[PDB]
């Protein structure tokens, strides 16, 4: 119990890995949105919406991990 | 169904006709022609031992018709000129397998319309016409004159 609990909490730390890759995926995404915006600003709003939209797909994995994290942390 | 020893330069990477000589021999008369010595590919281009084993299977399950003919048309008198041990082994193995051979005969012309092959017996000078359905020939060589005009070759056309 206490022995397995120790590795349980350790696994919960692993959930902070997507938190890292999600940040990098964000920095890269908005970079493409900016450079792409400059080449064709006529559709700014279109690009902008798709930008945040894409980001929503990033925090997806984030919440999924934390959910899976606390789950195995107690299941 | 006319095949040779090398691939022409017009074929692209999608043409694999070379590999269909043994496969696509469902029936008919087959002729493996050897030109007059000197020629290139004496032993490295003799594929009449693999075809026999592959065609022995086709006769077992019917892929190859039972009324077919395969004969080796050798313009020369011997297969390996400078090695009697090898040539004696070949002629010994060809008979053991059941293959037929015709010496002193060289391919002369090929008709692509009616599949007619014109052979000629250099010994008797008698030419004949034979229907073919799977023809393989080792590309014949030819002596270059610029080596004979300079007085370098000897006889056949090879360097002295």
């Amino acid at each position: 119990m206490l022995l397995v609990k120790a590795v349980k909490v350790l696994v919960m730390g692993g959930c902070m890995l997507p938190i890292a890759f999600g940040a990098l995926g964000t920095g890269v995404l908005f970079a493409g949105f900016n450079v792409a915006l400059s080449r064709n600003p006529e559709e700014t709003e279109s690009l902008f919406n798709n930008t945040l939209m894409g980001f929503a797909l990033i925090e997806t994995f984030i919440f999924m991990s934390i959910g899976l994290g606390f789950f195995v942390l107690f299941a | 169904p006319v095949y040779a020893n090398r691939d022409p330069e017009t074929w692209r990477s999608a043409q694999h006709k070379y590999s269909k000589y043994i496969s696509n021999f469902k029936s008919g008369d087959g002729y493996f022609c050897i030109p007059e010595y000197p020629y290139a590919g004496e032993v490295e281009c003799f594929n009449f031992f693999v075809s026999d084993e592959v065609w022995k299977w086709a006769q077992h399950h019917g892929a190859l018709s039972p009324k077919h003919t395969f004969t080796i048309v050798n313009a020369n008198e011997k297969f390996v000129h400078y090695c009697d041990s090898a040539d004696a082994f070949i002629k010994e193995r060809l008979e053991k397998r059941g293959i037929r051979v015709e010496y002193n005969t060289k391919l002369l012309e090929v008709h692509q319309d009616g599949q007619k092959a014109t052979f000629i017996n250099t010994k008797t000078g008698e030419k004949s016409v034979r229907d073919y359905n799977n023809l393989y020939s080792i590309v014949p060589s030819k002596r270059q004159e610029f080596l004979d005009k300079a007085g370098l070759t000897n006889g056949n056309g090879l360097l002295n």
């Binding site: - | 019917g62 892929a63 039972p66 359905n133």
Partner: protein, 256 residues
Amino acid sequence: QMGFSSDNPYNKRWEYKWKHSYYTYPRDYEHTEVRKPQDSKDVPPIYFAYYKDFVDRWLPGMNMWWQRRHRIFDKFNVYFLPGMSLFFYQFADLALGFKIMAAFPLFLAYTRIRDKTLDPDFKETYLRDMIYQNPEITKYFNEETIHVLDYEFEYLPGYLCPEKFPEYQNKTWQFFNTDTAQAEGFFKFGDVESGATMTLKFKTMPIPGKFRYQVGEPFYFYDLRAEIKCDGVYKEVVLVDEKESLKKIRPFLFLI
């Protein structure tokens, strides 16, 4: 001969080809004349839809297998596959793999029985393209004015003469086949514009094409003849002669 035949009088050479969109079968068979209300039976009996599916779909399907039963009586279907099924059926209670290896040879037999009993269908569009390219036929026949008077096409039974087709004297091929897979038939044609009639006789056999293991054309016309008859002129056209075709190409000898 057409194996799949119901009591329907029309379109006998298309009965197995036509895929109707009916939920069930029509009350009566296709009328050949205008009938009276009392000639047919209103509100057909109970369980009529099931009866029709049996006599219009099941029964003519079994008549096809019975008509061409001589093509499935090979030692492979008769002894090998049933024997293979019994060998593993004795161990069916030990594991599931025995139930499978015992039923597979039965599913394999049904597939060979299924394909071998079907009516032999040649590529008729290739045929009409061949005759309409001949000038001696287009003189009296055209697709806009031609009509069919009779049609016959059936497999040939047993092995053929072992001099014209020595291929079939192969004990390995005979183990899988009792028939030749060749077919023979004719076409009774008529032209309503010129008033001409001809009997288009043909013999077919499977041939290999361009490949090593697969068949190229299961029904290749190696003999195609037309005996044309007009007002007072009789012609005999030879589109494909067997003496010249059998020297170039040989049959395929289906296995399995």
